[model samples]
Target chain A: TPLFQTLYLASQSPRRQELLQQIGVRFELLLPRPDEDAEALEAELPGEAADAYVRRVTVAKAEAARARLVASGKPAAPVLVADTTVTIDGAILGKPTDADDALAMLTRLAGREHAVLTAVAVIDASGELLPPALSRSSVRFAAASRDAYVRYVETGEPFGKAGAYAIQGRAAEFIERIDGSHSGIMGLPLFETAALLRTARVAF
Target chain B: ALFPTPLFQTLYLASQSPRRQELLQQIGVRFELLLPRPDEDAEALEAELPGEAADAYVRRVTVAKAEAARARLVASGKPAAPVLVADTTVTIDGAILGKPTDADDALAMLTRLAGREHAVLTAVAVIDASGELLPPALSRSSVRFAAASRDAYVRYVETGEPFGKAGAYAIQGRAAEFIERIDGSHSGIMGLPLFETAALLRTARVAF
Candidate 1:
């Protein structure tokens, strides 16, 4: 790389890591420190809109990632943080806690249009936070049978997915249409992610 | 057997494009290239009929390619499997533009597509081993381009990337930098449609 392009990725999700590889950027994991509560950071605030909540969570993760990188005593570089959420009727949905929760979210999302939002933040080597970027995409799901939802839930793809589905999986058959960034719906928007890396002077 | 992949054995892909092969492989479709016989005239099949619309033209081309693939398979005397064929074309402002003929031709195509929204149409056809032709499926996607600098486009043409591409620009290559947005299937723009192809492959029982 012409520039110091590697990022300290503050996420354990394999989907996000694969997406970054898709766009040709390099990264290393920034595991949580002893005292940080990463999952608790994702908790929703009172009366928060989906947009505000996503961006807020992204910034918090970015700050935590920076701290973890410093405490690990590793060479410093830019830190990348991202958070994804699904929304319908202005309600933000998180990863399902159980099979019933997955079915409920999938049932509610069936035959409806939902918004997928991914907020991305880049923290430079010196802990300087740049303006974060957000990508919003819309997806429509076709009506499915109760049995279909049950079969899908059986696959375990819905457990960590906010909308109880992954766009790139077999559930694609149920996606009637998509009207925005496909990568955004995939957990990381390459268009937005590319621009973020470009602004960070990444050679790739 | 280690993966929850397709059920059958393999496929015969009647396309020489690496892009299409990459897409099929990504979907875990095990395929071997089925190229044209030396005696077959491939270009004649794509010659547009009088006053043919874009959709009709692509549909006609795919059908012809499928028939040719079937004939080739029989002639080679290879083990029978499903043969998959496809044809894609770029359309904008009510006209279809196939692969550019030369540097100047590529420049002209890119100039017309600059800052304009266009559609990419892909027609897919599959011939089962019994020589039965299933119904064809088509995918359409809309792509919007930024107003690229004339010099930039000229340099792009020099890279020779536009010679074999329908639209003189590639969404998966360096040209992605000039794309403002895409409102439809990303795989469609890459010369294949995964959803449509997957449906067809499953119905045909082609294994991964």
Candidate 2:
């Protein structure tokens, strides 16, 4: 019953784009300017909860996008910002440190139940950041074959993905089980995204 | 440290999916295709039995495929070796969702599966050199998709990815965005289960 929804997506992740498009939500990119330290937004504070860290980063992204939109004299609609993190025993695992780091990440994740937390925040027309939503999915990686993890990392899917493997990639073979949102683990949980859009009355 | 890899040679794969092929290769299993006969009506073999449960449906179809492959193997005069066959069925509430009859049928299936938990069942059977049917293995996986809009449904079906998949979705494709939860084998959702398949392969002496 709700086909018309429009929003400004603040991130340039192709997977995130597919997620919004998957639910038929039309959006335009609100990527950070060259002067903006997009990477700096992701810097982790020591001893922060994964949930708090993701929510904080997501809110910061939404605020930055909201400011960017107004600064450009563009219309104020919902600017959606989402952030995802991989945690094992409560430590954040950033994207692969390098090729070996990717292998090590995949190897480390092998046979363990890690958590994937995705946070979504949206800024409405009033420039008010609504409550951010969080989704947590538990994942169990299959024991790695050294060849397979190396093969998986060699494919380059690990560099851009959290958990050092993409659920939608060849790494799907290395995953034995997933107990949380597939889309969340993939980086943007569609269910939660849609719920936020509907409540904010986003129009396509 | 124990098994030290494989023994027997190539196992004939009586399947049509690259997903199955990828997994088999990933697990270090050697295989070759043993596709169906031109005369074989694969769809006809999948017709539901009277009140067949989801669990029963997958097991029966898998064995039925094995038998059909056996017939094909015997007729082809291919060397007697290990032949592997499997069937994957997506079911919800005890009803099996076969491939779409047409676009409308696929849309209906996608909409029906949009908000709930479903089961992906894979049954694997191996036929050995002696024509003996080894006890098959069944893998049941739980797949829960998020609530997607009808517009999303329209775009998905328009992509032409749903026409041939059980439940109008392929776990290995773009539809992964629609899946909210998966509690079982990712390979099983892709229409093969390597864990179960490998076990059966060992029993049938097909090697790894």
Candidate 3:
């Protein structure tokens, strides 16, 4: 017998879905209603700490997922949600606005140390929200050629990703050192997620 | 009209692991396999020295593989090129864990690894066509596993991924769930550290 089965995942990321399957967990997607302003959940508050911002957004996502589950008339199950942000010197770098923004982000990341912050929040079966878990990883890129950043941005992998890069992609070529959870930077921190699941008694 | 020389051609990869090949391809490096001949005692190259540290052992094996591969390339009629080789091992509590000898050995390894952190070390080296051996590079990483059930470990062993893999687990396989945290190069855990490998290739002037 397994611990728990069929978790409700409130994230749309392919990486998160793949990660869950990697750990032998079964999950069903719990998307927002068409009319729900999903983007608004991630709006940053003025003077917000990076950690606080990520936690708040994760909790908001879990809360919305819980309500969505209720409205769907689905059987009760644990709901999981997560959010990731990139920070340098305490400034949160969101998804790029355009090519220029992506290039700028990539250039800024080159030859420097930056932190990847990921927050995981869960809604247990009894309808109680668990405190979000945070994973912070520091990634440093080697001094690379300007053409390298430009070429990377041209790949379009930087558009929807924070810090305009995906560590799992071609950007791996430029990374010199990483001092945190690899899976966390990819969108979900497996260690923290596993701990949260154990607390919720969710099955693997 | 003159044609410009292509930015180097294919690299010669002297490893048998498919994961290493995939990683090389991931970075757009074209390679030709330089596996040992049937008569070559390739397995003997990995014999550990007495009281060898994990880092020292991996480095020694990596250099040995590169040297042997270089000799093989010369013996074969294949065109001369840089040969790349790497070695990976799992270490816990100062003891090195190599490939399991049997199912029981693999299960024992998993038991010891569950719910704790262990170190993965990978050493990579390159031998150019001139037979010059560049300094080897080592990548060290730490991986933690969740406390999974005994049944889970048994089932994982049944999958046969632990047989030829160090630490009795494969991070890229069903074992991924057991991994709680990894604080090093992901590719390093996979048998090749792209950062170090890339740096070596660049230094050797091997075009990707």
Candidate 4:
């Protein structure tokens, strides 16, 4: 028998969906409750570090997804969830709240190095929580002119992306180098995801 | 025997790869081997241009094999059957390495692959009963070979396994000990990609 009858992707990010498709993992969607605010759930608590906050939010989302499946009486077949965040000096730099916020984030990130952390979790059909995995990538941004930053901000790509940038999208030009999983910084870590799937008895 | 049509009932494998044959059997596809004719000249066609891309080269080989099988089918007067062909090669530092001919050559290839990442390219082609060539699918896998010693390489080569393998090693064989990482389809690296091959079979109207 195939490892999974059906797979549920808990998030609605197209990038995550595209990555899963590229790896040939057949999956269907699980929409969040219309009243469930993802940004509200992702809000950092006082004194919470970036890495811890990311993992906490990811686990919360996974738990919420499992609960949703139970309430809807849907057969859960490995619900997958992921959370990505950017950090510098233990400060979590999430998606910019506004254009000025994005410019400020980019200005602080210029000519400096930061870490992108992505956490992934899986809930089995029986609602058993599998071990979550975290991928951290060190990214160095190239020095950019204020004009370039403004132009990038106007494109609106930075509004919803973490750290006000998308490494695999238009902001790829601003990156000088990356020290870890390229796909992780893009929102998913292929290596870690593969390992997690294997552990969950999900065949590639 | 249970196929819907005679075209689906008969099939030919236009590859010499044992791994491919194993894969076909695994999928329960009955097939007969079709080797190149004795008089057929492949050497002239094997020459690659300077700096030729790996994907293009693999695709060319696939097409060449399909054409050769078509010619062979016409000459033999066999009933139209679905023909499948495949080619696998490895690239490192922009150098394409086919199957190694000697132990020294294999050793050199292994040494170069050690601790470094390389790309494995496999191209599969399928031709229908009407000799219509289906679009070939190329699977590229990034694999990193573990750093091994001269002794480890010598021992592996002594098994006489790397002689006929491109990149001087096989991930599914004894050289499994030398693989550190893989970033693409494993079946593709072995010889044929299951996902791609399934699609090809469907296109050729070969029902499972």
Highest DockQ among the candidates is held by which one? 3
Clashes counted in candidate 2 amount to 5
Compared with the true structure, model 2 gives a TM-score of 0.74
Best by TM-score: 3
Pick the lDDT winner: 3
* Cα-based lDDT for every prediction: 0.81, 0.79, 0.86, 0.77
lDDT of 4 by residue, A123-142 (tens): 87667888888988788776
Candidate 2 local lDDT, B9-117, one digit each (tens): 8888889888888888866678879897788887787777898787888888888888888888899998888888888888888887888988899899988998899
- Tell me the lDDT of model 2 at A143: 76
lDDT digits (tens) for residues A65-144 of candidate 1: 87788789999788888899999998989999999999999999988989999998888766689899898888877676
lDDT of 4 by residue, B44-162 (tens): 65567767898898899778878888788778887778899888778997789888889999999999998899998888889887889999989887887767688778877888889
Worst 10 residues of 2 chain B by lDDT: B1-10
Per-candidate TM vs. native?
0.82, 0.74, 0.88, 0.55
- Give the distance in Å from residue A86's predicted Cα in candidate 1 to where it truly belongs: 1.4
Rank by lDDT (best first): 3, 1, 2, 4
| iRMSD values, candidates in order | 4.9, 4.8, 4.9, 15.3
**TM-score of candidate 4 on Cα atoms, chains taken together:** 0.55
DockQ of each: 0.22, 0.23, 0.38, 0.02
Which parts of model 3 have CA positions greater than 4 angstroms off?
Answer: A1-3, A33-35, B1-6, B101-117, B129-131, B144-163, B173-180
CAPRI docking class of candidate 3? acceptable
Superposed model 4: Cα runs more than 4 Å off: B1-208
